[PDB]
Amino acid sequence: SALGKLQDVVNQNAQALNTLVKQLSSNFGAISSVLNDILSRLDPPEAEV
């Protein structure tokens, strides 16, 4: 850990991208997170919400 600051930069960027990708799985208050599924099993007027 001699190169602490540079390794910290790399880790911070990896952390940001990783959490950004993790947010996709989050439900966000809808019936399901995966978008194809929410499209498939509801009518378009209801699925829109």
Partner: protein, 45 residues
Amino acid sequence: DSFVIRGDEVRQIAPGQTGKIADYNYKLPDDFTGCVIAWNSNNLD
């Protein structure tokens, strides 16, 4: 638009609703429909 339908079909004719009349007979668009006015016509029949 003028047509004659039964009381249940009156519920059926709404935007985005799904029913035997709604699926095939008559479909409202996924957009505002101005108004829907329904009254029984049994005396006229």
